[PDB]
Nucleic acid binder design. Structure first.
Ligand code: ZN
Lengths: 101, 203, 142, 63, 69, 141, 140
RNA sequence: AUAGCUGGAUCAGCCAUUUUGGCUGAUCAUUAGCUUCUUAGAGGGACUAUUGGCAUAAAGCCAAUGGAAGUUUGAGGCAAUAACAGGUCUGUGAUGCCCUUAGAUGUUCUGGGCCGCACGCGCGCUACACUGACGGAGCCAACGAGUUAUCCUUGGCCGGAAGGUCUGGGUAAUCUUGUUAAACUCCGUCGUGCUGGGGAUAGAGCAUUGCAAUUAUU
């Protein structure tokens, strides 16, 4: 009736994995259909620019990369447990969002 | 025997006949002109000339390539058509069947005899380094003989069919049959004679 | 023998279905009988005046093979390279008016039916006609 | 009569000013003797057949 | 140049000249006679329903035909 | 497939122009100035004449009916969106362009653009391109 | 039951199959092996079928789906997929010596049917449209 | 179940069919379990192992089976050292010096422009034809982007696909999108002639973007 979907979008692999491990461990501490992590395709943004501030010089083009990683988690937790786990899952560099309905 | 799919008996009969060519036999054709053995894969029977493989990785990997495939590769000239293998394969197939229609013998045998007769024996490299800038008579390797024959046949076919009603396949077939025998009407044979005579002249 | 159009030659089936549709002959082709070049990609007049029938047959077979077909999808699948003057050729879709006209004509015939989730679907009569014409083509060799 | 096939089994290295001409030792079939040195414009490997007409040249090197 | 006047001679000539050769196509008939291209394929199509020429393998550019034997 | 011993009468004068005798009608009609390819195809199709036959076997009735249809295209259910000239400057209608009239229409348009003395007019007088093209490197000799 | 699965690739083309026990019914994406998109590229698909004949194929039902790549890539993918599906079926459900002889026969007459083909296009480098081709220098 | 596979409430099409059905699938959050194929966290794997040969029978070299891999596994990135009297004070509230500051070398609104040509030099493009062009038809990929007021687009309908119509999907591997591409192929014509190969070049109307398209945006 009340399914909680939370986002696990970030760029730091280590910290997003740590957040994902923490919530999965809590979801295994209290049985909530033990739904595990789900991995989404990486959204990588490729931009190519020049290096020379002026126009003089050889044709050199620098390509930069910007990739983000998304994960989704579905839980059957009650409101009190949901607010508790979100309180303990405060980490830097991790953006989370919960959709109710 | 047959399955739900049509499975035409032509393929089954081809398999029974030790997998001959598209419409020509494979068992009974060999290089008859001497000095060009172990460099043309006549015995390597392939249903189609095309073979997307590695033909330049090794120093002499080119020697094991199919003679028909090498000729299709030579026909890939004119960068307007650089990369259109389907057109070259259709032209080669049409030329081969026209050769079979003209003369009863194996068109592959016609082809092998043509390249063998066209292949130059004596060339003339340049000494260079300024001075008299003369040239000296030099013989050539069998692999380069095939290369010269293929290039001369292809350039002659392109020159003959550059502006005329006759099709490219017909002109290629005419060049191959005229080069397989001695009729003095082949541009490739003429260039063969020209290279030989200049080589003997500067020798 | 459970024969469908999957194991039938493409161009021969298109011509045969065009002739079969020609038997009914209720397309009611629009005013631009032989003046519209079915889009911007084309640049001349067709040499076969009966291309409306072959187009209708092609659409019927296309909707049989696929799930849903739209006007925009029909333009992108029946477009082609455009000779944009001296500039290198690009790809542009065809005119939607002609494709919509053929779609409406086929629906008036009773071969295409509208469906949910956008687009349309193949009618029951279209499927039965497809099966019978496939059987007839397979048995055409006595 | 001028046409006589020969065999090459070894190479003396890559010679020539431009390096595009090789020099190899030849060996005739009908005469196991009479080993000559000739300048070949094509790539020559071990145990390869050669066709030569002016059999009496004994070319040493190319300048 | 190739003539195109239908002077009753071309139709009889081609009908009595088909058995001369086996391979019949636009490339060879141009050499055979001054044909401008239209009759080149029209005559072949009109002779297809006759038993003189037997088809082998047809293509859009050209089609292969052979004689009776 | 068709009658071989037919009638041939070489070429004939048409609209102060020559129509080729032994030539495919599509090729022959391009010789008439003001005729393209699709225009030639559509007018012949609306004229309802056999396409296989060339212009050397046509009769007087077919020739006259074809040219009259060309002279009056819009009257014979020919669409007006195809017409080269629509809403003429002088006529005020979608008049059809021809060969003899275009022999003087080009100079008539030149005097139309020159008398009123446009920038385009002086470009035409000085024989330079009228559109915003470039001549720094191209447009030479 | 007796069934296996496999796939085949030639770069940016993929073709995944699903072997099954049957009495024929061999098709390639609805159409049979006889009817394909090209016409001069038919014997390439037919290459592994003729080597072992159709008697061994009379006891298998295989339908192979093709997705991705060009025309030559697709025909190579489907022929690779059917060849590997057949050898997987005959490795798992008939004698090892029979598989050894079939694989060896396929290897002896092999147009890269079984062995994967690591053919890839090198990345384009800056300074020119091609990876190695570069714009000409006016040198003056 | 933000993507595919199978079972299953869920129904359509006939040759066979009342044990006799194959198949496309329609809906798939109505429902269940799995990732061969989608994704990423960790990884394994090759080190020229393995014999067959050269090199002072070390460091090192060549060929071959297996394998995916032998070129340092490939292609790239960062890259010591000093040299250019190289470029950028018109990217830089980064700045030293000379000059100006009210009739301002300050801000700002309108019109003309950087694209203005009897030429010389470049980087790329078009055809010089049948390998092409035209016309129908079968169809086979990847990387990337998008609305908080105001972008990517679907569907019914009108049209001269150039536009506009209304409910509308999309803050996103859920919508465009599965970017059904092109090249190719089945068939007919153009028959070899600077012609229907090639559209330099000139004219008349039809629309969106933009105080508005002359010096024609497209
Ligand atoms: Zn800036």
């Amino acid at each position: 009736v009340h399914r909680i979907r939370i986002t696990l979008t970030s760029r730091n692999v280590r910290n997003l994995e740590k957040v994902c491990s923490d919530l999965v461990n809590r979801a295994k501490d209290k049985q909530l259909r033990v739904k595990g992590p789900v991995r989404l395709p990486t959204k990588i943004l490729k931009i190519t620019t020049r290096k020379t501030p002026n126009g003089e010089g050889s044709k050199t083009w620098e390509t930069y990369e910007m990739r983000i990683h998304k994960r989704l988690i579905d839980l059957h937790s009650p409101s009190e447990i949901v607010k508790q786990i979100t309180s303990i899952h405060i980490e830097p560099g991790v953006e989370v969002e919960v959709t109710i309905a | 025997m047959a399955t739900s799919s049509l499975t035409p008996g032509v393929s089954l009969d081809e398999n029974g006949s030790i997998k001959l060519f598209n419409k020509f036999p494979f068992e009974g054709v060999e290089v008859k002109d001497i000095s060009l053995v172990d460099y043309i894969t006549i015995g390597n029977g392939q249903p189609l000339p095309h073979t997307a493989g590695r033909f330049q990785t090794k120093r002499f990997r080119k020697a094991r390539c199919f003679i028909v495939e090498r000729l299709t590769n030579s026909l890939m000239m004119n960068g307007r058509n650089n990369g259109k293998k389907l057109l070259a394969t259709r032209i080669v197939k049409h030329a081969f069947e026209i050769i079979a229609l003209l003369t009863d013998q194996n068109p592959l045998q016609v082809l092998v005899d043509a390249v063998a007769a066209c292949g130059p024996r004596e060339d003339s490299t340049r000494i260079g380094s300024a001075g008299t800038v003369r040239r000296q008579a030099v013989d050539v390797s069998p692999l380069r003989r095939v290369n010269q024959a293929l290039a001369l046949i292809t350039i002659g076919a392109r020159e003959a069919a550059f502006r005329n009603v006759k099709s490219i396949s017909e002109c290629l077939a005419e060049e191959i049959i005229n080069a397989a025998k001695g009729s003095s009407n082949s541009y490739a044979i003429k260039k063969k004679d020209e290279l030989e005579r200049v080589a003997k002249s500067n020798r | 023998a459970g024969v469908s159009v999957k194991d039938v030659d493409a161009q021969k089936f298109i011509t045969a279905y065009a002739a079969f549709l020609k038997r009914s002959g209720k397309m009611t082709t629009p005013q631009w009988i032989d003046i519209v070049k079915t889009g911007t990609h084309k640049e001349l007049a067709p040499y076969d005046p009966d291309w409306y029938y072959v187009r209708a047959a092609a659409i019927a077979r296309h909707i049989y093979l696929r799930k849903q077909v739209g006007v925009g999808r029909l333009c992108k699948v029946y477009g082609g390279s455009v000779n944009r003057g001296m500039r290198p050729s690009h790809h542009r879709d065809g005119s939607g008016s002609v494709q919509r006209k053929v779609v409406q004509s086929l629906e008036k015939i009773g071969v295409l039916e509208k469906s949910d989730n956008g687009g349309r679907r193949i009618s029951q009569q279209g499927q039965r006609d497809l099966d019978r014409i496939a059987y007839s083509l397979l048995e055409e060799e006595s | 009569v001028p046409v006589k096939l020969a065999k090459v089994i070894k190479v003396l290295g890559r010679t020539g000013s431009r390096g595009g001409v090789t020099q190899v030792r030849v060996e005739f079939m009908d005469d196991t003797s009479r080993s000559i040195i000739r300048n070949v414009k094509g790539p020559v490997r071990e145990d390869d057949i050669l066709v030569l007409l002016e059999s009496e040249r004994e070319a040493r090197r190319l300048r | 140049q190739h003539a195109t006047v239908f002077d009753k001679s071309i139709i009889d000539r081609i009908n009595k000249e088909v058995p001369a050769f086996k391979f019949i196509s636009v490339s060879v008939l141009v050499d055979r006679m001054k044909i401008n291209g239209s009759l080149a394929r029209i005559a072949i199509r009109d002779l297809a329903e006759r038993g003189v020429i037997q088809k082998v393998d047809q293509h859009s550019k050209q089609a292969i035909y052979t004689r009776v034997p | 497939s068709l009658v071989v011993p037919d009638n041939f009468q070489h070429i004939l004068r048409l609209l102060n122009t020559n129509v080729d005798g032994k030539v495919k009608v599509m090729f022959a009609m391009t010789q008439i100035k003001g005729v393209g390819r699709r225009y030639a195809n559509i007018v012949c199709k609306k004229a309802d004449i056999d396409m296989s036959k060339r212009a050397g076997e046509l009769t007087t009735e077919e020739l006259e009916r074809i040219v009259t249809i060309i002279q009056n295209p819009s009257q014979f259910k020919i669409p007006s969106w195809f017409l080269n000239r629509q809403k003429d400057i002088n006529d005020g209608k979608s008049f059809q362009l021809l060969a003899n009239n275009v022999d003087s229409k080009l100079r008539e348009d030149l005097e139309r653009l020159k008398k009123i003395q446009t920038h385009r007019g002086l470009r035409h007088a000085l024989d330079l391109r009228v559109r915003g093209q470039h001549t720094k490197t191209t447009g030479r000799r | 039951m007796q069934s296996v699965q496999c796939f085949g690739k030639k770069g940016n083309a993929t073709a995944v199959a699903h072997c099954k026990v049957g009495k024929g019914l061999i098709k390639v994406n609805g159409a049979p092996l006889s009817l394909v998109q090209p016409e001069i590229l038919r014997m390439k698909v037919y290459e592994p079928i003729l080597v072992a004949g159709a008697d061994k194929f009379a006891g298998v039902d295989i339908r192979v789906r093709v997705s991705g790549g060009g025309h030559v890539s697709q025909i190579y993918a489907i022929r690779q997929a059917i060849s590997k599906a057949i050898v997987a079926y005959y490795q798992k459900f008939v004698d090892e010596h029979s598989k050894a002889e079939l694989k060896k026969a396929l290897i002896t007459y092999d147009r890269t049917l079984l062995v994967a083909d690591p053919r890839r296009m090198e990345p384009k480098k800056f300074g020119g449209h091609g990876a190695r081709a570069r714009q000409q220098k006016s040198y003056r």
